[PDB]
Amino acid sequence: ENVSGVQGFLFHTDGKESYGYRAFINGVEIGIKDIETVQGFQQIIPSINISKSDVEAIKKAMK
Amino acid sequence: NVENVSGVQGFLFHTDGKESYGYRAFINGVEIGIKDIETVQGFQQIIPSINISKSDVEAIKKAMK
Amino acid sequence: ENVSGVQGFLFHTDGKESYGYRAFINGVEIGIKDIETVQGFQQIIPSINISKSDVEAIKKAMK
Amino acid sequence: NVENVSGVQGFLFHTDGKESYGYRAFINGVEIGIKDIETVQGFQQIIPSINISKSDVEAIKKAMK
Protein backbone atom coordinates (compact mmCIF):
# COMPACT_ATOMS: atom_id res chain seq x y z
CA GLU A 1 0.00 0.00 0.00
CA ASN A 2 1.02 3.62 -0.50
CA VAL A 3 1.91 4.54 3.04
CA SER A 4 2.97 8.04 1.95
CA GLY A 5 -0.46 9.30 0.98
CA VAL A 6 1.02 10.84 -2.19
CA GLN A 7 0.28 9.79 -5.76
CA GLY A 8 1.97 11.61 -8.65
CA PHE A 9 5.31 12.54 -10.14
CA LEU A 10 7.87 15.28 -10.53
CA PHE A 11 8.49 16.61 -14.00
CA HIS A 12 11.05 18.87 -15.66
CA THR A 13 12.74 19.39 -19.01
CA ASP A 14 16.41 19.28 -19.88
CA GLY A 15 15.74 21.31 -23.04
CA LYS A 16 16.94 24.78 -23.84
CA GLU A 17 14.27 26.66 -21.82
CA SER A 18 13.74 25.19 -18.37
CA TYR A 19 10.49 25.54 -16.49
CA GLY A 20 12.04 24.38 -13.21
CA TYR A 21 10.69 21.32 -11.41
CA ARG A 22 6.96 20.85 -11.07
CA ALA A 23 4.89 18.04 -9.67
CA PHE A 24 1.45 16.51 -9.77
CA ILE A 25 0.58 15.60 -6.18
CA ASN A 26 -2.79 13.88 -5.68
CA GLY A 27 -4.06 15.44 -8.91
CA VAL A 28 -2.86 18.96 -8.04
CA GLU A 29 -0.15 20.64 -10.11
CA ILE A 30 2.43 22.67 -8.13
CA GLY A 31 5.76 24.29 -8.77
CA ILE A 32 8.74 23.26 -6.69
CA LYS A 33 11.13 26.04 -5.73
CA ASP A 34 14.07 24.30 -4.01
CA ILE A 35 16.17 21.27 -4.99
CA GLU A 36 15.98 20.02 -1.42
CA THR A 37 12.25 19.48 -1.95
CA VAL A 38 12.86 17.78 -5.30
CA GLN A 39 15.21 15.27 -3.71
CA GLY A 40 12.83 14.78 -0.80
CA PHE A 41 9.94 13.90 -3.09
CA GLN A 42 12.20 11.70 -5.23
CA GLN A 43 12.27 9.38 -2.22
CA ILE A 44 8.55 8.67 -2.61
CA ILE A 45 7.35 9.53 -6.17
CA PRO A 46 8.88 9.10 -9.62
CA SER A 47 10.67 11.92 -11.40
CA ILE A 48 10.37 12.05 -15.20
CA ASN A 49 11.24 14.37 -18.10
CA ILE A 50 8.50 16.23 -20.00
CA SER A 51 9.34 18.74 -22.74
CA LYS A 52 8.00 22.26 -22.36
CA SER A 53 5.87 21.81 -25.50
CA ASP A 54 4.22 18.70 -24.09
CA VAL A 55 3.33 20.01 -20.61
CA GLU A 56 0.00 21.46 -21.73
CA ALA A 57 -1.25 18.10 -23.07
CA ILE A 58 -0.14 16.27 -19.92
CA LYS A 59 -1.89 18.89 -17.79
CA LYS A 60 -5.14 18.21 -19.67
CA ALA A 61 -4.89 14.43 -19.13
CA MET A 62 -4.13 14.88 -15.40
CA LYS A 63 -7.27 17.01 -14.83
CA ASN B 1 1.96 -6.70 -9.81
CA VAL B 2 3.48 -3.80 -7.85
CA GLU B 3 2.05 -0.55 -6.46
CA ASN B 4 1.59 2.32 -8.94
CA VAL B 5 2.69 5.50 -7.21
CA SER B 6 2.54 7.77 -10.24
CA GLY B 7 -1.20 8.32 -10.42
CA VAL B 8 -0.94 7.62 -14.19
CA GLN B 9 -2.55 4.69 -16.01
CA GLY B 10 -2.06 4.24 -19.73
CA PHE B 11 0.52 3.57 -22.37
CA LEU B 12 2.55 5.09 -25.19
CA PHE B 13 1.91 3.84 -28.69
CA HIS B 14 3.54 4.17 -32.10
CA THR B 15 3.80 2.16 -35.32
CA ASP B 16 6.92 0.84 -37.03
CA GLY B 17 4.92 0.20 -40.18
CA LYS B 18 4.27 2.35 -43.16
CA GLU B 19 2.73 5.72 -42.36
CA SER B 20 4.14 6.65 -38.95
CA TYR B 21 1.84 8.79 -36.76
CA GLY B 22 4.63 9.68 -34.39
CA TYR B 23 4.30 8.79 -30.71
CA ARG B 24 0.94 9.14 -28.93
CA ALA B 25 -0.32 8.09 -25.51
CA PHE B 26 -3.38 7.30 -23.42
CA ILE B 27 -2.98 9.03 -20.04
CA ASN B 28 -5.81 8.36 -17.59
CA GLY B 29 -8.20 7.74 -20.47
CA VAL B 30 -7.21 10.83 -22.47
CA GLU B 31 -5.55 10.39 -25.87
CA ILE B 32 -2.69 12.81 -26.58
CA GLY B 33 -0.04 13.36 -29.20
CA ILE B 34 3.54 13.57 -27.92
CA LYS B 35 5.68 16.24 -29.55
CA ASP B 36 9.22 15.57 -28.23
CA ILE B 37 11.30 12.44 -27.78
CA GLU B 38 12.28 13.67 -24.30
CA THR B 39 8.66 13.25 -23.18
CA VAL B 40 8.51 9.78 -24.69
CA GLN B 41 11.56 8.73 -22.71
CA GLY B 42 10.13 10.31 -19.56
CA PHE B 43 6.81 8.51 -19.75
CA GLN B 44 8.60 5.27 -20.61
CA GLN B 45 9.84 5.35 -17.01
CA ILE B 46 6.30 5.02 -15.65
CA ILE B 47 3.98 3.48 -18.29
CA PRO B 48 4.34 0.78 -20.94
CA SER B 49 5.17 1.60 -24.54
CA ILE B 50 3.65 -0.68 -27.18
CA ASN B 51 3.21 -0.88 -30.95
CA ILE B 52 -0.20 -0.25 -32.57
CA SER B 53 -0.73 -0.23 -36.33
CA LYS B 54 -2.17 2.99 -37.77
CA SER B 55 -5.19 0.95 -38.97
CA ASP B 56 -5.98 -0.19 -35.40
CA VAL B 57 -5.79 3.14 -33.56
CA GLU B 58 -9.47 4.00 -34.07
CA ALA B 59 -10.67 0.72 -32.55
CA ILE B 60 -8.32 1.13 -29.57
CA LYS B 61 -9.56 4.69 -29.00
CA LYS B 62 -13.13 3.36 -28.75
CA ALA B 63 -12.09 0.88 -26.05
CA MET B 64 -9.96 3.43 -24.18
CA LYS B 65 -12.89 5.93 -24.00
CA GLU C 1 -1.20 -2.15 -9.88
CA ASN C 2 -2.20 -2.17 -13.54
CA VAL C 3 -0.21 0.77 -14.78
CA SER C 4 -1.41 0.19 -18.36
CA GLY C 5 -5.04 1.07 -17.80
CA VAL C 6 -6.08 -1.96 -19.86
CA GLN C 7 -7.92 -5.03 -18.58
CA GLY C 8 -8.79 -7.84 -20.99
CA PHE C 9 -7.34 -10.35 -23.42
CA LEU C 10 -6.73 -11.13 -27.06
CA PHE C 11 -8.49 -14.12 -28.52
CA HIS C 12 -8.29 -16.12 -31.75
CA THR C 13 -8.83 -19.65 -33.02
CA ASP C 14 -6.38 -21.98 -34.70
CA GLY C 15 -9.28 -23.99 -36.15
CA LYS C 16 -10.23 -24.39 -39.77
CA GLU C 17 -12.10 -21.06 -40.12
CA SER C 18 -10.21 -18.16 -38.57
CA TYR C 19 -11.95 -15.06 -37.30
CA GLY C 20 -8.69 -13.11 -37.05
CA TYR C 21 -7.55 -11.67 -33.71
CA ARG C 22 -10.05 -9.92 -31.49
CA ALA C 23 -9.78 -8.47 -28.03
CA PHE C 24 -11.81 -7.47 -25.02
CA ILE C 25 -10.36 -4.17 -23.81
CA ASN C 26 -11.97 -2.72 -20.67
CA GLY C 27 -15.16 -4.64 -21.42
CA VAL C 28 -15.32 -3.56 -25.08
CA GLU C 29 -14.95 -6.12 -27.87
CA ILE C 30 -12.89 -5.01 -30.89
CA GLY C 31 -11.33 -6.59 -33.92
CA ILE C 32 -7.60 -6.26 -34.46
CA LYS C 33 -6.49 -5.78 -38.05
CA ASP C 34 -2.67 -5.92 -37.95
CA ILE C 35 -0.24 -8.37 -36.33
CA GLU C 36 1.86 -5.45 -35.13
CA THR C 37 -1.02 -4.47 -32.86
CA VAL C 38 -1.45 -8.06 -31.67
CA GLN C 39 2.19 -8.24 -30.61
CA GLY C 40 1.97 -4.80 -29.03
CA PHE C 41 -0.97 -5.80 -26.86
CA GLN C 42 0.66 -9.14 -26.03
CA GLN C 43 3.16 -7.07 -24.03
CA ILE C 44 0.41 -6.01 -21.61
CA ILE C 45 -2.58 -8.42 -21.78
CA PRO C 46 -2.89 -12.19 -22.14
CA SER C 47 -3.57 -13.85 -25.48
CA ILE C 48 -5.69 -17.03 -25.45
CA ASN C 49 -7.40 -19.39 -27.90
CA ILE C 50 -11.21 -19.47 -28.20
CA SER C 51 -12.95 -21.64 -30.80
CA LYS C 52 -15.30 -19.92 -33.23
CA SER C 53 -18.25 -21.88 -31.80
CA ASP C 54 -17.51 -20.67 -28.28
CA VAL C 55 -17.07 -16.94 -29.00
CA GLU C 56 -20.78 -16.19 -28.65
CA ALA C 57 -20.96 -17.61 -25.11
CA ILE C 58 -17.82 -15.75 -24.04
CA LYS C 59 -19.24 -12.53 -25.49
CA LYS C 60 -22.35 -12.97 -23.31
CA ALA C 61 -20.29 -13.48 -20.13
CA MET C 62 -18.11 -10.44 -20.90
CA LYS C 63 -21.14 -8.11 -21.24
CA ASN D 1 -1.58 -13.13 -4.97
CA VAL D 2 -0.70 -11.38 -8.25
CA GLU D 3 -2.51 -8.80 -10.39
CA ASN D 4 -5.28 -10.11 -12.68
CA VAL D 5 -4.95 -8.31 -15.99
CA SER D 6 -7.49 -10.38 -17.91
CA GLY D 7 -10.68 -8.83 -16.57
CA VAL D 8 -11.99 -12.41 -16.09
CA GLN D 9 -12.86 -14.01 -12.75
CA GLY D 10 -14.08 -17.58 -12.59
CA PHE D 11 -13.10 -21.14 -13.26
CA LEU D 12 -13.54 -24.11 -15.57
CA PHE D 13 -15.19 -27.20 -14.16
CA HIS D 14 -15.72 -30.80 -15.24
CA THR D 15 -16.21 -34.20 -13.61
CA ASP D 16 -14.09 -37.32 -13.97
CA GLY D 17 -16.87 -39.39 -12.44
CA LYS D 18 -19.71 -41.23 -14.01
CA GLU D 19 -21.94 -39.09 -16.21
CA SER D 20 -19.61 -36.47 -17.71
CA TYR D 21 -21.23 -33.09 -18.47
CA GLY D 22 -18.32 -31.97 -20.59
CA TYR D 23 -16.43 -28.82 -19.65
CA ARG D 24 -18.29 -25.76 -18.33
CA ALA D 25 -17.17 -22.48 -16.80
CA PHE D 26 -18.17 -19.55 -14.63
CA ILE D 27 -16.97 -16.34 -16.34
CA ASN D 28 -17.68 -13.16 -14.37
CA GLY D 29 -20.64 -14.83 -12.68
CA VAL D 30 -22.15 -16.28 -15.86
CA GLU D 31 -22.32 -20.06 -16.28
CA ILE D 32 -21.50 -21.32 -19.78
CA GLY D 33 -20.97 -24.60 -21.55
CA ILE D 34 -17.70 -24.94 -23.47
CA LYS D 35 -17.97 -26.65 -26.84
CA ASP D 36 -14.34 -27.14 -27.97
CA ILE D 37 -11.20 -28.35 -26.24
CA GLU D 38 -9.30 -25.42 -27.79
CA THR D 39 -11.35 -23.02 -25.66
CA VAL D 40 -10.72 -25.09 -22.56
CA GLN D 41 -6.99 -24.88 -23.12
CA GLY D 42 -7.24 -21.15 -23.81
CA PHE D 43 -9.10 -20.34 -20.63
CA GLN D 44 -6.77 -22.60 -18.66
CA GLN D 45 -4.12 -19.95 -19.33
CA ILE D 46 -6.04 -17.34 -17.32
CA ILE D 47 -8.44 -19.04 -14.85
CA PRO D 48 -8.29 -22.15 -12.67
CA SER D 49 -9.73 -25.46 -13.78
CA ILE D 50 -11.20 -27.66 -11.06
CA ASN D 51 -13.27 -30.83 -10.66
CA ILE D 52 -16.93 -30.66 -9.57
CA SER D 53 -19.16 -33.73 -9.33
CA LYS D 54 -22.32 -33.64 -11.44
CA SER D 55 -24.35 -33.90 -8.20
CA ASP D 56 -22.76 -30.70 -6.81
CA VAL D 57 -23.14 -28.39 -9.82
CA GLU D 58 -26.57 -27.09 -8.79
CA ALA D 59 -25.37 -26.01 -5.34
CA ILE D 60 -22.30 -24.29 -6.84
CA LYS D 61 -24.49 -22.44 -9.35
CA LYS D 62 -26.54 -21.03 -6.46
CA ALA D 63 -23.39 -19.68 -4.80
CA MET D 64 -21.94 -18.34 -8.06
CA LYS D 65 -25.16 -16.37 -8.82
Next chain:
Amino acid sequence: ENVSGVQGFLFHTDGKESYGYRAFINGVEIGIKDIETVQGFQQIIPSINISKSDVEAIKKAMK
Protein backbone atom coordinates in the same frame (compact mmCIF):
# COMPACT_ATOMS: atom_id res chain seq x y z
CA GLU E 1 -5.97 -10.80 -7.42
CA ASN E 2 -8.49 -13.60 -6.92
CA VAL E 3 -8.81 -14.83 -10.46
CA SER E 4 -11.20 -17.60 -9.36
CA GLY E 5 -14.09 -15.37 -8.38
CA VAL E 6 -14.60 -17.45 -5.22
CA GLN E 7 -14.09 -16.27 -1.65
CA GLY E 8 -14.72 -18.67 1.24
CA PHE E 9 -13.71 -22.00 2.73
CA LEU E 10 -14.66 -25.62 3.11
CA PHE E 11 -15.45 -26.86 6.59
CA HIS E 12 -16.00 -30.24 8.24
CA THR E 13 -15.52 -31.95 11.59
CA ASP E 14 -13.47 -35.00 12.44
CA GLY E 15 -15.54 -35.52 15.60
CA LYS E 16 -17.83 -38.38 16.41
CA GLU E 17 -20.85 -37.13 14.40
CA SER E 18 -19.89 -35.89 10.95
CA TYR E 19 -21.93 -33.32 9.08
CA GLY E 20 -20.14 -34.01 5.80
CA TYR E 21 -18.27 -31.23 3.99
CA ARG E 22 -19.86 -27.83 3.67
CA ALA E 23 -18.60 -24.57 2.27
CA PHE E 24 -19.13 -20.85 2.38
CA ILE E 25 -18.84 -19.62 -1.21
CA ASN E 26 -19.18 -15.85 -1.71
CA GLY E 27 -21.17 -15.62 1.53
CA VAL E 28 -23.51 -18.51 0.66
CA GLU E 29 -23.49 -21.70 2.72
CA ILE E 30 -23.83 -24.95 0.75
CA GLY E 31 -23.43 -28.64 1.37
CA ILE E 32 -20.97 -30.60 -0.72
CA LYS E 33 -22.05 -34.11 -1.68
CA ASP E 34 -19.01 -35.67 -3.41
CA ILE E 35 -15.33 -35.83 -2.44
CA GLU E 36 -14.38 -35.00 -6.02
CA THR E 37 -15.91 -31.56 -5.48
CA VAL E 38 -14.14 -31.17 -2.13
CA GLN E 39 -10.77 -31.82 -3.73
CA GLY E 40 -11.64 -29.54 -6.64
CA PHE E 41 -12.42 -26.63 -4.34
CA GLN E 42 -9.35 -27.37 -2.20
CA GLN E 43 -7.35 -26.19 -5.23
CA ILE E 44 -8.74 -22.66 -4.83
CA ILE E 45 -10.09 -22.11 -1.26
CA PRO E 46 -8.90 -23.18 2.19
CA SER E 47 -10.33 -26.20 3.96
CA ILE E 48 -10.58 -26.03 7.77
CA ASN E 49 -12.07 -28.00 10.67
CA ILE E 50 -15.11 -26.68 12.58
CA SER E 51 -16.77 -28.74 15.32
CA LYS E 52 -20.47 -29.47 14.96
CA SER E 53 -21.21 -27.44 18.10
CA ASP E 54 -19.47 -24.38 16.68
CA VAL E 55 -21.06 -24.32 13.21
CA GLU E 56 -24.06 -22.28 14.35
CA ALA E 57 -21.88 -19.43 15.68
CA ILE E 58 -19.75 -19.39 12.53
CA LYS E 59 -22.91 -19.30 10.41
CA LYS E 60 -24.06 -16.19 12.30
CA ALA E 61 -20.73 -14.39 11.74
CA MET E 62 -20.72 -15.27 8.02
CA LYS E 63 -24.20 -13.75 7.46
Next chain:
Amino acid sequence: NVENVSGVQGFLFHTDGKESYGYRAFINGVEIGIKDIETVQGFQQIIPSINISKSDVEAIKKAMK
Protein backbone atom coordinates in the same frame (compact mmCIF):
# COMPACT_ATOMS: atom_id res chain seq x y z
CA ASN F 1 0.77 -8.90 2.37
CA VAL F 2 -0.88 -11.73 0.41
CA GLU F 3 -4.40 -12.25 -0.96
CA ASN F 4 -7.06 -13.39 1.52
CA VAL F 5 -9.17 -16.02 -0.21
CA SER F 6 -11.16 -17.11 2.83
CA GLY F 7 -13.62 -14.23 3.02
CA VAL F 8 -12.88 -14.09 6.79
CA GLN F 9 -11.25 -11.17 8.61
CA GLY F 10 -10.60 -11.35 12.32
CA PHE F 11 -8.65 -13.18 14.96
CA LEU F 12 -8.84 -15.72 17.77
CA PHE F 13 -8.11 -14.51 21.27
CA HIS F 14 -7.52 -16.07 24.68
CA THR F 15 -5.66 -15.23 27.89
CA ASP F 16 -2.88 -17.17 29.59
CA GLY F 17 -3.39 -15.13 32.75
CA LYS F 18 -5.55 -15.74 35.73
CA GLU F 19 -9.23 -16.23 34.94
CA SER F 20 -9.28 -17.91 31.52
CA TYR F 21 -12.32 -17.11 29.35
CA GLY F 22 -11.59 -19.94 26.97
CA TYR F 23 -11.02 -19.17 23.29
CA ARG F 24 -13.11 -16.51 21.52
CA ALA F 25 -12.91 -14.88 18.10
CA PHE F 26 -13.88 -11.88 16.02
CA ILE F 27 -15.14 -13.13 12.64
CA ASN F 28 -16.09 -10.37 10.20
CA GLY F 29 -16.83 -8.02 13.09
CA VAL F 30 -18.91 -10.51 15.09
CA GLU F 31 -17.64 -11.69 18.48
CA ILE F 32 -18.16 -15.40 19.19
CA GLY F 33 -17.21 -17.94 21.80
CA ILE F 34 -15.48 -21.08 20.52
CA LYS F 35 -16.59 -24.32 22.14
CA ASP F 36 -14.14 -26.95 20.81
CA ILE F 37 -10.38 -27.04 20.34
CA GLU F 38 -10.91 -28.52 16.86
CA THR F 39 -12.49 -25.23 15.76
CA VAL F 40 -9.63 -23.26 17.26
CA GLN F 41 -7.13 -25.27 15.27
CA GLY F 42 -9.23 -24.90 12.13
CA PHE F 43 -9.48 -21.14 12.32
CA GLN F 44 -5.78 -20.92 13.17
CA GLN F 45 -5.20 -22.01 9.57
CA ILE F 46 -6.81 -18.83 8.21
CA ILE F 47 -6.74 -16.05 10.87
CA PRO F 48 -4.25 -14.93 13.51
CA SER F 49 -4.49 -16.07 17.10
CA ILE F 50 -3.37 -13.57 19.74
CA ASN F 51 -3.42 -13.09 23.52
CA ILE F 52 -5.77 -10.55 25.15
CA SER F 53 -6.06 -10.12 28.91
CA LYS F 54 -9.54 -10.62 30.36
CA SER F 55 -9.42 -6.98 31.57
CA ASP F 56 -8.89 -5.69 28.00
CA VAL F 57 -11.61 -7.63 26.17
CA GLU F 58 -14.30 -4.98 26.69
CA ALA F 59 -12.18 -2.22 25.17
CA ILE F 60 -11.28 -4.41 22.17
CA LYS F 61 -14.95 -5.26 21.62
CA LYS F 62 -15.72 -1.53 21.38
CA ALA F 63 -13.09 -1.09 18.67
CA MET F 64 -14.12 -4.24 16.80
CA LYS F 65 -17.79 -3.10 16.63
Next chain:
Amino acid sequence: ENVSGVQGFLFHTDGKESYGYRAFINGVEIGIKDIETVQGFQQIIPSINISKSDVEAIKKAMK
Protein backbone atom coordinates in the same frame (compact mmCIF):
# COMPACT_ATOMS: atom_id res chain seq x y z
CA GLU G 1 -4.77 -8.65 2.46
CA ASN G 2 -5.26 -7.81 6.12
CA VAL G 3 -6.69 -11.06 7.36
CA SER G 4 -6.82 -9.74 10.94
CA GLY G 5 -9.51 -7.14 10.39
CA VAL G 6 -7.50 -4.64 12.45
CA GLN G 7 -5.89 -1.45 11.18
CA GLY G 8 -3.96 0.78 13.59
CA PHE G 9 -1.06 0.89 16.01
CA LEU G 10 -0.07 0.78 19.64
CA PHE G 11 1.53 3.87 21.10
CA HIS G 12 3.34 4.75 24.32
CA THR G 13 6.05 7.09 25.59
CA ASP G 14 9.33 6.26 27.26
CA GLY G 15 9.48 9.79 28.72
CA LYS G 16 9.33 10.79 32.34
CA GLU G 17 5.52 10.60 32.70
CA SER G 18 4.06 7.46 31.15
CA TYR G 19 0.51 7.27 29.89
CA GLY G 20 0.60 3.48 29.63
CA TYR G 21 -0.03 1.76 26.29
CA ARG G 22 -2.85 2.94 24.09
CA ALA G 23 -3.94 1.94 20.63
CA PHE G 24 -5.87 3.13 17.63
CA ILE G 25 -7.90 0.15 16.41
CA ASN G 26 -10.00 0.74 13.28
CA GLY G 27 -10.07 4.46 14.04
CA VAL G 28 -11.06 4.02 17.70
CA GLU G 29 -8.68 5.07 20.48
CA ILE G 30 -8.51 2.72 23.50
CA GLY G 31 -6.34 2.24 26.52
CA ILE G 32 -4.63 -1.09 27.05
CA LYS G 33 -4.43 -2.29 30.64
CA ASP G 34 -2.27 -5.45 30.53
CA ILE G 35 1.09 -6.19 28.89
CA GLU G 36 -0.26 -9.53 27.70
CA THR G 37 -2.64 -7.61 25.43
CA VAL G 38 0.16 -5.33 24.24
CA GLN G 39 2.25 -8.31 23.17
CA GLY G 40 -0.78 -9.95 21.59
CA PHE G 41 -1.50 -6.93 19.43
CA GLN G 42 2.19 -6.53 18.59
CA GLN G 43 1.77 -9.74 16.59
CA ILE G 44 -0.60 -7.98 14.18
CA ILE G 45 -0.16 -4.16 14.35
CA PRO G 46 2.87 -1.89 14.71
CA SER G 47 3.92 -0.44 18.04
CA ILE G 48 5.48 3.05 18.01
CA ASN G 49 6.57 5.75 20.47
CA ILE G 50 4.60 9.02 20.78
CA SER G 51 5.52 11.64 23.38
CA LYS G 52 2.82 12.71 25.82
CA SER G 53 2.90 16.25 24.40
CA ASP G 54 2.26 14.99 20.88
CA VAL G 55 -0.66 12.63 21.60
CA GLU G 56 -3.27 15.36 21.27
CA ALA G 57 -2.18 16.28 17.72
CA ILE G 58 -2.07 12.63 16.65
CA LYS G 59 -5.56 12.12 18.10
CA LYS G 60 -6.85 14.99 15.94
CA ALA G 61 -5.33 13.52 12.75
CA MET G 62 -6.74 10.05 13.51
CA LYS G 63 -10.33 11.37 13.87
Next chain:
Amino acid sequence: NVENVSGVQGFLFHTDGKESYGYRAFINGVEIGIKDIETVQGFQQIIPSINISKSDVEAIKKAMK
Protein backbone atom coordinates in the same frame (compact mmCIF):
# COMPACT_ATOMS: atom_id res chain seq x y z
CA ASN H 1 4.31 -2.47 -2.47
CA VAL H 2 3.30 -4.15 0.81
CA GLU H 3 0.16 -4.00 2.96
CA ASN H 4 -0.20 -0.97 5.26
CA VAL H 5 -1.53 -2.21 8.57
CA SER H 6 -1.13 1.04 10.50
CA GLY H 7 -4.15 2.91 9.17
CA VAL H 8 -1.82 5.94 8.68
CA GLN H 9 -0.94 7.53 5.34
CA GLY H 10 1.42 10.47 5.18
CA PHE H 11 4.97 11.53 5.84
CA LEU H 12 7.25 13.48 8.15
CA PHE H 13 8.98 16.53 6.74
CA HIS H 14 11.74 18.90 7.82
CA THR H 15 14.35 21.13 6.19
CA ASP H 16 18.13 21.00 6.53
CA GLY H 17 18.39 24.45 5.00
CA LYS H 18 18.43 27.84 6.58
CA GLU H 19 15.44 28.58 8.79
CA SER H 20 14.47 25.21 10.28
CA TYR H 21 10.75 24.77 11.05
CA GLY H 22 11.37 21.72 13.17
CA TYR H 23 9.70 18.43 12.23
CA ARG H 24 6.12 18.38 10.92
CA ALA H 25 3.93 15.68 9.40
CA PHE H 26 0.92 14.97 7.23
CA ILE H 27 -1.15 12.24 8.94
CA ASN H 28 -4.22 11.15 6.98
CA GLY H 29 -4.40 14.54 5.29
CA VAL H 30 -3.97 16.59 8.48
CA GLU H 31 -0.86 18.75 8.89
CA ILE H 32 0.65 18.73 12.39
CA GLY H 33 3.72 20.02 14.15
CA ILE H 34 5.76 17.44 16.06
CA LYS H 35 7.07 18.57 19.43
CA ASP H 36 9.42 15.76 20.55
CA ILE H 37 12.12 13.75 18.80
CA GLU H 38 10.66 10.58 20.35
CA THR H 39 7.52 11.04 18.24
CA VAL H 40 9.60 11.62 15.13
CA GLN H 41 11.42 8.34 15.68
CA GLY H 42 8.13 6.56 16.37
CA PHE H 43 6.44 7.71 13.20
CA GLN H 44 9.59 6.95 11.22
CA GLN H 45 8.76 3.30 11.89
CA ILE H 46 5.53 3.53 9.89
CA ILE H 47 5.68 6.47 7.43
CA PRO H 48 8.38 8.00 5.24
CA SER H 49 10.41 10.98 6.35
CA ILE H 50 11.48 13.41 3.62
CA ASN H 51 13.06 16.85 3.23
CA ILE H 52 10.96 19.86 2.15
CA SER H 53 12.37 23.38 1.91
CA LYS H 54 10.61 26.00 4.03
CA SER H 55 9.74 27.86 0.79
CA ASP H 56 7.88 24.81 -0.59
CA VAL H 57 5.73 23.90 2.43
CA GLU H 58 2.80 26.11 1.41
CA ALA H 59 2.52 24.52 -2.04
CA ILE H 60 2.70 21.01 -0.55
CA LYS H 61 -0.02 21.87 1.97
CA LYS H 62 -2.31 22.86 -0.92
CA ALA H 63 -1.78 19.48 -2.58
CA MET H 64 -2.13 17.53 0.67
CA LYS H 65 -5.52 19.20 1.45
